[PDB]
Symmetry: C4
Subunit: 118 residues, 4 copies
């Protein structure tokens, strides 16, 4: 049988300003995507720690080094600039692989400064 496992997550990133509208997606600095193992166009779950909302959308890449986290445009109702969120992707795999699977986790503080641990 096939398990659904946390692939990776961006832990407590902050939603930022962004000039562009992102058409229902969440735009995410490519560096952050790299660290969490998240792909452009991948389904993602976003858990808003500030307001408690939980929603699902898809990831798009923002410019590397922009530190952008944006639901600007069509997804603006579920998060606001300043809100602290967790962004997760989930993958499927056989049970044996699942049993020793290690998610790709990136932790954030401050001005979306990324760390390997908390």
């Amino acid at each position: 049988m096939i398990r659904t496992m946390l692939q990776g997550k961006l832990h407590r990133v902050k939603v930022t300003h962004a000039d562009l509208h992102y058409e229902g997606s969440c735009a995410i600095d490519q560096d952050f995507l790299d660290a969490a193992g998240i792909l452009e166009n991948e389904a993602i779950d976003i858990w808003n720690v500030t307001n408690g909302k939980r929603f699902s959308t898809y990831a798009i890449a923002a410019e590397r080094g922009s530190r952008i986290i944006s639901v600007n445009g069509a997804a603006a109702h579920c998060a606001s600039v300043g809100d602290i969120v967790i962004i997760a992707s989930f993958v499927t795999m056989p049970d044996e692989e699942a049993r020793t699977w290690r998610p790709n986790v990136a932790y954030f503080e401050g001005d979306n400064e990324m760390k390997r641990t908390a």
Copy 2:
């Protein structure tokens, strides 16, 4: 391992019909389904830009050229006529393929005119 990826979407289509008598699906102009790669009987997510509601149902085809987006059944509780929505479907594939995957996106203006 296997990723879940955006297969395609209809971006900012307008709801044209919303009846609370059968069938719990969203009926979509076949031309629109064709552009977004969405299949009859495929699971779809619908994100209401107008009222913020987010729900899931399945697609059925409406008459080609009709430019209908009809939210039927229980789903009629979650969108009204005139609401702007995004309709999306997701597919799975091996990670290796997902790295180069490109979704099928259709954009709209006015009264469901596809760009």
Copy 3:
């Protein structure tokens, strides 16, 4: 790539009385499960046409011919006796199979009298 397709559904069944508690599941007359192609322990989505609620749980079989549809017990908050619901299961399959896939649909009226069409 792999599609998520409507496997089958019970269209506008009515939630009934039931003496037993069903532990978070929806108990469903085995005859109805047969017609919609739904399995015991299968994940199911329930769309409540009466109150607009949409939730996901799993199916268990009720006695054949009981005509039971019950969320009695731990799932009682999302539907009430008399409410009209649609119960769906979804399966995955390759795109080619998906393109000619036909869901198993059962329609209901009256005292959960089942029909092949509407």
Copy 4:
């Protein structure tokens, strides 16, 4: 085709801890995970019998014998200490296997004593 089936569940466990500072997961006594077949880092659904909320997160192991059910992070918005919940995981498998599939269920009473 491939079915989604209940893999296992913890039936009517009580929430023992709920902190809104890391990590967005549900920490569960390893003995409980063992009984229900739920894995560390597995997606789980949580159905709050007490307040009716239904949400999804992932599992992590708590200390064996602790009888802890800890809803952390944003999930702390959806359950409080003393709430009764059901925690479930789902798996996929071919239809042929799904026809004979049996979930792993653990029942509880009192303060998270497994039957």
